[PDB]
Amino acid sequence: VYADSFVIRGDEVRQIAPGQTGKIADYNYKLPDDFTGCVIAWNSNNLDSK
Amino acid sequence: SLSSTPSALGKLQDVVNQNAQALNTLVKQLSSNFGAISSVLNDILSRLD
Amino acid sequence: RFASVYAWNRKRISNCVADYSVLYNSASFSTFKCYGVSPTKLNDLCFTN
């Protein structure tokens, strides 16, 4: 299993998916089209927003 | 009798016509969408991801 | 002066060169839903009117 953890904005979570486009998914983290796995996300403004 | 009647050899001609019609149907079925957005492969491969 | 819903404003863009990649790469849009076409292939396609 490979766990890739990173922090993005709110309207950029939808970019983490196979075939999606956006400034997150085309220059930083590209997901393969034949991706088999999970994409979990959670708001953490209490831990990453001072 | 063979020279006068144009439809004397109506069995071999029917076989030829049947084969030609089958091939024509096969070659004309390439212009059907079959539910796709286009009947051209190079259009679907150029307009869609 | 954006138009109203019941009077949506229609403009005919014709006879020019459209850089769809400029709008596609802009982050000032929330939804960019393309139906029947793909934004990555809009730059390589020639439409009309």
Curated annotation (Swiss-Prot), chain C:
Changing residue 31 to A: In strain: Omicron/BA.2, Omicron/BA.2.12.1, Omicron/BA.4, Omicron/BA.5, Omicron/BQ.1.1, Omicron/XBB.1.5, Omicron/EG.5.1. This is Spike protein S1. Binds to host ACE2. RBD also interacts with the N-linked glycan on 'Asn-90' of ACE2. Cleavage of S generates a polybasic C-terminal sequence on S1 that binds to host Neuropilin-1 (NRP1) and Neuropilin-2 (NRP2) receptors. Interacts with host integrin alpha-5/beta-1 (ITGA5:ITGB1) and with ACE2 in complex with integrin alpha-5/beta-1 (ITGA5:ITGB1). May interact via cytoplasmic c-terminus with M protein. May interact (via N-terminus) with host bilirubin and biliverdin, thereby preventing antibody binding to the SARS-CoV-2 spike NTD via an allosteric mechanism. Changing residue 28 to P: In strain: Omicron/BA.1, Omicron/BA.2, Omicron/BA.2.12.1, Omicron/BA.2.75, Omicron/BA.4, Omicron/BA.5, Omicron/BQ.1.1, Omicron/XBB.1.5, Omicron/EG.5.1. Attaches the virion to the cell membrane by interacting with host receptor, initiating the infection. The major receptor is host ACE2. When S2/S2' has been cleaved, binding to the receptor triggers direct fusion at the cell membrane. When S2/S2' has not been cleaved, binding to the receptor results in internalization of the virus by endocytosis using host TFRC and GRM2 and leading to fusion of the virion membrane with the host endosomal membrane. Alternatively, may use NRP1/NRP2 and integrin as entry receptors. It comes from the Viruses.
